[PDB]
Amino acid sequence: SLLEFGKMILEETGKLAIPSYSSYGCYCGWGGKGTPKDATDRCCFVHDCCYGNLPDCNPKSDRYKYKRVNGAIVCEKGTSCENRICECDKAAAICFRQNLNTYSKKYMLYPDFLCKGELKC
């Protein structure tokens, strides 16, 4: 679920998901078009594709269970949708952590008209 993914992002990165990732670039938090602006935005593009792979799941509201094993995120077994949604969110949180070194505040509230073209998942 969205709130759960937000907490995972905060725990991972130390950034609050809103406002740090909720409107970043072309893909983080809204939008479906254009070339991702940077590696962080690419994480969101891939996460959007990940959710897109699950058209009969509901990642915004469906809560999955996961644990931290030392630092490792381990998705615990729930329904197939929860397992799949968890792996999507785990990957995005890791991706965000891997790219904090290039995260740029200049892409927060990035305007829609600068995001053009379909990029296929």
Partner: peptide, 5 residues
């Protein structure tokens, strides 16, 4: 904070 994305 830390819902969205």
């Amino acid at each position: 904070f830390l819902a969205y994305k």
